[PDB]
Amino acid sequence: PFHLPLNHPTYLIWSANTSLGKTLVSTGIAASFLLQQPSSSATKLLYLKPIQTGFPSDSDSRFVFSKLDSLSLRRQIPISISNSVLHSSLPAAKSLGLNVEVSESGMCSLNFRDEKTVTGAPELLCKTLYAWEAAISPHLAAERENATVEDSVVLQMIEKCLKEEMDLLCLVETAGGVASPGPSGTLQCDLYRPFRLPGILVGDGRLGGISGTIAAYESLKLRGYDIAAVVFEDHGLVNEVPLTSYLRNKVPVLVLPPVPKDPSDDLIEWFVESDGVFKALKETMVLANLERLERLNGMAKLAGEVFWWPFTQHKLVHQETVTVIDSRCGENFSIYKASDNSSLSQQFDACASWWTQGPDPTFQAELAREMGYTAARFGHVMFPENVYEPALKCAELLLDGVGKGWASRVYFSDNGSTAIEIALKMAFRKFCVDHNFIVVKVIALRGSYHGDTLGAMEAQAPSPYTGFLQQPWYTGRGLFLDPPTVFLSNGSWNISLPESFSEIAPEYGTFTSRDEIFDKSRDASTLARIYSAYLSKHLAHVGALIIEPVIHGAGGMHMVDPLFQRVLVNECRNRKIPVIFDEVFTGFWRLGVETTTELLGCKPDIACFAKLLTGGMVPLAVTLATDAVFDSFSGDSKLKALLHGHSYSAHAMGCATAAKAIQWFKDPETNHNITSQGKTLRELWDEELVQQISSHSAVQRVVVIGTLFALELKSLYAKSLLIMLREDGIFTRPLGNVIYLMCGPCTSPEICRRLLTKLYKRLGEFNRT
Amino acid sequence: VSPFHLPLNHPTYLIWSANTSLGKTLVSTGIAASFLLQQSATKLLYLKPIQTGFPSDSDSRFVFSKLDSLSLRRQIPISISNSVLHSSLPAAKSLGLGMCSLNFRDEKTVTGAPELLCKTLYAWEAAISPHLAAERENATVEDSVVLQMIEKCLKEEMDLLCLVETAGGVASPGPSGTLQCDLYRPFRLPGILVGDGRLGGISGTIAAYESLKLRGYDIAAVVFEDHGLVNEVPLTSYLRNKVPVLVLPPVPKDPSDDLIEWFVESDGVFKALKETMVLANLERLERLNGMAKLAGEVFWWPFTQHKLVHQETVTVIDSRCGENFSIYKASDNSSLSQQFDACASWWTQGPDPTFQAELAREMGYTAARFGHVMFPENVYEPALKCAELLLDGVGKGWASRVYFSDNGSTAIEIALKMAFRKFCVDHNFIVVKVIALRGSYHGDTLGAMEAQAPSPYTGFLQQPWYTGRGLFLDPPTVFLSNGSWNISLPESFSTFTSRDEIFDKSRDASTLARIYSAYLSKHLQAHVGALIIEPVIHGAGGMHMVDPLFQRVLVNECRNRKIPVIFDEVFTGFWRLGVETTTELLGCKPDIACFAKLLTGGMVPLAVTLATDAVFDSFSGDSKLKALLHGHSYSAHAMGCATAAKAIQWFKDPETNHNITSQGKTLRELWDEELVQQISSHSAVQRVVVIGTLFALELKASLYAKSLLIMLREDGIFTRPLGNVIYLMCGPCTSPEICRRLLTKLYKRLGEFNRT
Ligand SMILES: *Cc1c(COP(=O)(O)O)cnc(C)c1O
Ligand SMILES: *Cc1c(COP(=O)(O)O)cnc(C)c1O
């Protein structure tokens, strides 16, 4: 996780294309910042050129260093100046005549500095981080010169330099255009994204420059960057008018006077003539940062005054614990802490933002482009009796995948809770059609959860959460059975039977592996027969079975014995009771599979999906049904149809995003966790760390499967772990004594390993064992 | 203000470019030559809508002339023509003849041979970008005029392939100043992108491609001139190989070169380009012609009896641009045509074509910056901004809290939880029920349903668990008929010149006022723990206007008895009725209010329940079990928040919504007064309700209504039935002129039942 100080402004200098005067602009800003009269000892300009090709003939570090030297003399204001090149290809080093040693990556480390100090004066500090010799775009230079630098290495160097230096202003000058490939091949705009630094855009004042400037600006916006200003060289075409117009005058557009064409010109008098514009640029950049922090420093207090957060007792919430989230990039929030030293730092989103979370940084950026396109093409268009490409594509993908082998209809709605209410209407018709047309109720497992609208609530068993104070109209309309659960403890997997159960011999009740728990061999066991009897015993009329397959999420991340659910499902189907799988939580790879029908070994009549359905970008819900359930609403009367609808039913925005995620999560080319056969994710959670955590004395049980790692503490332990993890850069949310880490379908195991290591070390702080 | 018709039977493509001087005209010519010079039916239509630097520069002439040469070179005769239809005066003076019309043609026919047909539609002389040329030469052409000429040309000519070559870059201003990519958007033609093979060209090609994608265009291919930098590798990689990238060989640098051998050498690439364009069109139509049949097999539409739905009436919607769907009709002659979305896509609809494009960039940014991030106990810019704008606007003078949820129906359930706590806290902690107006509607989830009165639509067959938990009163309604406005009182009970007089507080001193309070007071004194209303208009119930006086009296009685008041503004909110909130119309404020639909300017779901400090307080405690424990996983999704913050400002700002004034509290009248009177006085019309963006009429009964629906559809107007009620619903920014056309068409159809 990165740490970025936010106390002093730091800006990316972007450009529409090469040869627009990017370096001239940096130099200009620097000169206006350093060569102020109210001369302060405190004043320092940090200039970073991370990537530089054409070295040493070209060097934008040297250019800035050298030009400010001249402007210092010209303006009669002394300054301290330095220029450094930290790394360069072998070819590049051989030019300087250094003959340094090559490293693993093909890069040499240099001791090439050049100082000209003046004590007490304002300080200019120029660094080039990596340099290549060929005067060509970085990706090409890298391969020809056999010298690479990985993306995160570049970002780490930048981070390192920033931390060391931090009145103060830092300029990070990019290489080539907004969307030019860096050394690794990554587009520059993607390379810098994890930092999401604010920037300025050097536009193009030539003919064709309005388009090139707008396109570049937009590509930036489309990755989440903010641009405080556009500046360009005047060529007499008045480009700034359409530009200002397009920007709705929300971002200043500054015009530099023409640059001397004579190749032998010192440029000094141009800089002097351009001073007004650079002054405006500097001021704009400084004020935008000021204004940006003013907002951040106020956000938490203001949130507590104006929001009414869901599921949260406001009286217990204090300003100090409201988290300020400035952005996300894949699995990581960037969070602002004034406490720190004003800074933005990464934090892993281990609650997966209410179990929605899913995209990689690469996927997030892809989705953003898919969504902008969908807004522009479709906005929202009326669903009933209509068809449009994204809703249809989404239905095909659902039916051919998660719906394969049972479903033939897709009914759209807005979220899990609406999908469920629909599912209950669906189940009850089918039930009534199959039993000659009278009070109906559900059969469910106590602990299961199905959303917070009234209908969804009724399928939930009575509890402190459903009393009169929460919903006066709740009546608990169900037969609720207590489920066998299963968990890891001290190296092995166990069954835990409810009181109502027989009491089984210790021989049964223990398993070698998680796999056995799910092995259909178990249909032949005494436990199955006991399960069957138990259910036959218990089975107003039961008109629907509703279950959370495998995991009861909201109920505390318990694993329900899959055998028991499979037996329950069969019994209900035998008695013509429609079966609903509430897969809102489990769907789309949460548990390592596309649908838990692969885990339970049986298929439903009706099923609900949401959360990960749209890869965590936006709400959309879906209820799949069998032909037979559909038929039970077929008739001549509109009164007979299923009359539930929401205005945004099947919104193109959500459909497009889901179609995109459903394919991306499942494709071995985009999801490297997807296994050779395409039905399952590889194990994401370090096997040894999981055993160790399962064996710790503070830990009552562990449930681990696909993207979910959960433990229940034997609670002060639980309050404390939450705080401790948060100090480790891990953000999660309490579930009573249950603590959990939830990654996305594409998260790398290496990341997961780090999460478990941190968690385990914190456990050792309660007791060594 | 007319709807376009675009034949889809033959491929038509925009030729886009990253920048000037990349060889856009070379590419057109190349495609054309490959298409025409195949070894009678074949015709290539080449359109250059905008041209500057004329006559020294003329891409028409270039194509015409190069095709002539390639015909000779390849020994295959063709018919060729070149025409320039309009040009500024300066330009015409050059030829020796603010826009002038020209006859300037140049034919060389060969009977029976394949036909090349080149047209320049508008020309300027100055060799500079179009927006500049236009002002210097005092020669303008409006955006819709350009599109109409293009439409005209396409219809007249329509084996066949059409190329429309743009001017300058993807985002260069056209003559009027509109960016080229916005100018052509209403047509949403597929295109190809001429990229840049020079240094710096990977970036500029990606940037240009993205700006296109970011407006809803599809790009079948990228092609560029090779400069030896191997630009096509990063490009292919960026495009995940979903779109071919073709590389033309280097173009002769010598200024005196024919180019004929270059075209010959480049034939492979141009055939691939041609094939790509033709196949993409073929496959596109194959999908369209299949969509309706497939929808009926796979979808389960909401609120729709599938058995009564037939393939022929499933609408295929290829895109929207502001108020207009583009719909595909195979019946027609394969074609995309505009249709006004007059049901406002379930009363969500709002954006202008300008606003839609703006919202699309705001949304991509929000996806890229935030995705979805956890709401509870957190804060992020878009959710917070949205809350401020809500509280400072729609919530001004009463609300202090914003509670996010996913749609109208969830907002309502939350509102009901809110209301009941406050009620119980104020009455020492027992069955509770709602008081409501029969006919009102509040969403389809169970809790929302309970606030709705028993009806065929809440029986056992729809929701077995519905019990009707309310005291439901019959509301006085109000409507226009034969020139004047009337009250209609319910059995249980028993003329204004202008709609204005109905909303006047003076009616508080009136007669009905006291009758109302009598009635209400009696019925009021299981417990009534909440008042819930659809202010002003009962939407789903038939677009009835409820007497605002009656609602205001009901609200005051309930507040007097300490019964919390909920305004369900999910329909009425955000300018649906000409005001930001109906609190402006009713003259009283609620304790709790729900918003959705237009809240996000029709792009995407998001809902909100606003509350007073006092309601909030009734959940303050030391126990988490006392908090309000309703939540949805996507609560306050940044996508929806950002969008709403954007729309709330845009709809209200006289700069972006020309229907708004700067007094800034109300929209100007959008519906032609005379046409409204006429329609209100037609013999087939029982009543009219007109206000803000809503025009509704109820037919006497019904055959006329099933009929009007079909008739309007033939007139390019898409709406949806509400029993005998027929309605037109525009967005907050729709121009009156457009509305007038809607009324004209509706009135004309009425005249087909009876003259009067
Ligand atoms: C989250 C969830 C729901 C409800 O979905 P929302 O979109 O949050 O309302 C329903 N069922 C299960 C199992 C869930 O996890
Ligand atoms: C549409 C509507 C609702 C429900 O909104 P959805 O988002 O469609 O659930 C609630 N109240 C009124 C008055 C509405 O029009």
Ligand SMILES: [Mg+2]
């Ligand atoms: Mg050209």
